[PDB]
Amino acid sequence: HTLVWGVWVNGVDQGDGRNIYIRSPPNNNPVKNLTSPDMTCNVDNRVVPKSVPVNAGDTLTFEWYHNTRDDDIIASSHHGPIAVYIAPAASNGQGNVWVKLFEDAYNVTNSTWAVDRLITAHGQHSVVVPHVAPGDYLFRAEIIALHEADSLYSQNPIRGAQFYISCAQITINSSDDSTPLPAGVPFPGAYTDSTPGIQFNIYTTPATSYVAPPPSVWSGALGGSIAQVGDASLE
Ligand SMILES: OC[C@H]1O[C@@H](O[C@H]2[C@H](O)[C@@H](O)[C@H](O[C@H]3[C@H](O)[C@@H](O)[C@H](O)O[C@@H]3CO)O[C@@H]2CO)[C@H](O)[C@@H](O)[C@@H]1O
Numbered sequence: 001h002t003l004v005w006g007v008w009v010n011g012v013d014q015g016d017g018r019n020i021y022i023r024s025p026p027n028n029n030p031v032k033n034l035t036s037p038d039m040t041c042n043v044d045n046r047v048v049p050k051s052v053p054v055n056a057g058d059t060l061t062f063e064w065y066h067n068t069r070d071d072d073i074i075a076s077s078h079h080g081p082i083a084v085y086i087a088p089a090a091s092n093g094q095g096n097v098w099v100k101l102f103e104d105a106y107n108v109t110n111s112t113w114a115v116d117r118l119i120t121a122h123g124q125h126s127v128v129v130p131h132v133a134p135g136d137y138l139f140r141a142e143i144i145a146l147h148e149a150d151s152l153y154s155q156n157p158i159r160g161a162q163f164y165i166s167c168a169q170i171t172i173n174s175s176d177d178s179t180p181l182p183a184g185v186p187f188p189g190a191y192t193d194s195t196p197g198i199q200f201n202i203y204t205t206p207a208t209s210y211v212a213p214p215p216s217v218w219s220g221a222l223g224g225s226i227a228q229v230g231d232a233s234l235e
């Protein structure tokens with residue numbers, strides 16, 4: 001159970017974005033139905049009044065929280081991967097539009113899931129803004145909590161992989177467009193009951209064997225991190 005509070009751009013806090021530049025849902029409950037319209041941008045997908053200005057190459061940091069800013073972030077039980085996708089904003093997230101910019105699942109070197117490291121990072125993970133066409137975009141940050149994912153939601157709706165999905169409205173101003181954004185995958189649609197990484201038993205299957213759901217990270221993606229960029233406590 002987690003939400004995005006706001007974003008940072010090059011280590012500068014853009015301020016509380018909830019219902020302003022984040023298409024915030026009404027609460028921190030997960031989406032679990034893989035065929036739900038709620039898989040696009042969570043349960044209240046609508047245009048919000050602001051879009052955060054960035055340039056290509058900026059570090060864009062998402063900041064998550066549980067109940068209040070800079071708290072425990074997400075229950076430690078919620079082990080799983082983190083991904084970020086981008087789509088042009090005029091799509092409203094509909095159609096074959098989502099391109100993956102970032103994936104982090106289980107780090108064998110550290111012996112930790114992405115969610116475990118997100119807690120240590122005070123809720124913060126970042127991407128480099130890609131060199132796509134200037135214009136308005138949706139950045140879809142997705143945490144998948146796997147503590148109940150041994151079942152399919154379609155078999156037992158009390159269980160299933162849990163999707164914490166947050167869409168930020170981002171405007172890319174300066175970009176040379178050296179990596180034009182291709183068509184991508186649909187949400188809902190990209191994840192199905194048979195997709196690798198959706199049904200996974202963390203109690204019985206080693207995390208060293210986990211394969212995160214496709215699609216693979218786009219060749220145009222410039223990277224990211226799970227690390228505290230900004231100190232919310234200094235404000
Ligand atoms: O026992 C089932 C699993 O519970 C997980 O805890 C979650 C609770 O089930 C859920 O009711 C609670 O929801 C809170 C939410 O955290 C809070 O932010 C909001 O204000 O109210 C909600 C409803 O009361 O969330 C927790 C997770 O934070 C355990 O983490 C898990 O191990 C356990 O299997």
Ligand SMILES: OC[C@H]1O[C@@H](O[C@H]2[C@H](O)[C@@H](O)[C@H](O[C@H]3[C@H](O)[C@@H](O)[C@H](O)O[C@@H]3CO)O[C@@H]2CO)[C@H](O)[C@@H](O)[C@@H]1O
Pocket residue numbers: 102103104105106107211212215216217218219220
């Ligand atoms: O962050 C670690 C996670 O990595 C996942 O693999 C993706 C990498 O994160 C991503 O950097 C890489 O990007 C490739 C790109 O696919 C390719 O087209 C381009 O030309 O070169 C890049 C090399 O940096 O993509 C991979 C696959 O999506 C793992 O899936 C995950 O287990 C791990 O935690």
Ligand SMILES: [Cl-]
Pocket residue numbers: none
């Ligand atoms: Cl839960």
Ligand SMILES: [Cu+2]
Pocket residue numbers: 001002075078
């Ligand atoms: Cu939860």
